[PDB]
């Protein structure tokens, strides 16, 4: 329930963004946060966190996101 700083590499052209997340956040809620803050529609977001393609209902905690500076890759679909 402490904030985590997530390093995100976005590839559609690339950009690196810093997100602030909570470990109990679902991938669905992450997609919603990024939709509002960056404009990427949830249906077009594909999240990779540690060798796995993250599914909407999985938590960041379940994918090993635990400490500031942890990384995720975001790919944007056509």
């Amino acid at each position: 329930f402490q904030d985590i700083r997530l390093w995100v590499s976005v590839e559609d052209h690339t950009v690196t963004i810093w997100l602030t997340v909570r470990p109990d956040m679902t991938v669905a809620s992450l997609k919603d946060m990024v939709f509002l803050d960056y404009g990427f529609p949830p249906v077009l977001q594909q999240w990779v966190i540690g060798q796995r393609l993250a599914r909407d209902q999985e938590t960041l905690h379940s994918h090993g996101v635990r400490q500031n500076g942890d990384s995720a890759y975001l790919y944007l679909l056509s």
């Binding site: 052209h13 690339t14 950009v15 509002l36 803050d37 960056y38 404009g39």
Partner: protein, 236 residues
């Protein structure tokens, strides 16, 4: 004697709701709030359709996810209002102490005057056609999903801007303080030159705008150049 007025009003209000409204739980929280002189009133997620007179000492009003169409007068020390996910058609006059206002996901048609200490304004998913003049300490402006035809000039500490899914035809010049600008799905045909002067870590999303051919060449002559050090601009 002041307390009796409030307890009486809340008492009367508790008995006049519809059966879905969790008025009894609200009455108890208001009571605890007033009698402990509590800083935050949290009536969120209590299916309320109106609110009564509010405890005058609160600095945070947490009323998200109810069914409110209007608010009562806002107590004059409020610093934070979380009113998102209601059915609000308008907001009352805003207290001068107000710093954060979240009224996203409502039905608001126009906003009242924005007070001079406001730093965060989140009013996405409303029905706004125009915005009030923006105050000088504003750091975050979230107005995506409205009906905005135009947007006022940006004050010079604005760091985050989201105005996606509007009808905006012209974008005012962007201050260097801006690190994040969501402009997607509007009616822009040109961009202000100041967009190229934002920081290298800055982000601009301008997808879904009918940017002209000359605009596209003008910008990409700079953004595709080898010595480019301006922000990352997403065009699609």
């Amino acid at each position: 004697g002041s307390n009796e007025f409030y307890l009486k009003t809340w008492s009367e209000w508790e008995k006049n709701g519809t059966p879905g409204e969790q008025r009894n739980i609200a009455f108890n929280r208001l009571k605890i709030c007033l009698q402990n002189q509590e800083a935050e009133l949290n009536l969120s997620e209590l299916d309320l359709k109106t609110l009564p007179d509010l405890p005058p000492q609160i600095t945070t009003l947490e009323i998200r996810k109810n069914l409110l169409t209007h608010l009562p007068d806002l107590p004059p020390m409020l610093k934070v209002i979380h009113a998102q996910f209601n059915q609000l058609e308008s907001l009352p006059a805003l207290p001068e102490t107000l710093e954060e206002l979240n009224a996203g996901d409502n039905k608001i048609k126009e906003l009242p005057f924005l007070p001079e200490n406001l730093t965060h304004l989140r009013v996405h998913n409303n029905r706004l056609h125009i915005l009030p003049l923006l105050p000088p300490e504003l750091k975050l402006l979230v107005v995506s999903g409205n009906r905005l035809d135009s947007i006022p000039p940006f004050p010079d500490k604005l760091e985050g801007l989201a105005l996606a899914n509007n009808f905006i035809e012209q974008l005012p010049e962007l201050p260097f303080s801006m690190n994040r600008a969501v402009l997607m799905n509007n009616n822009l045909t040109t961009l202000p030159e100041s967009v190229l002067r934002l920081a290298q870590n800055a982000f601009v999303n301008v997808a879904g705008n009918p940017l002209s051919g000359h605009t596209m060449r003008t910008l990409q002559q700079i953004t595709t150049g080898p010595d480019y050090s301006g922000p990352r601009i997403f065009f699609s």
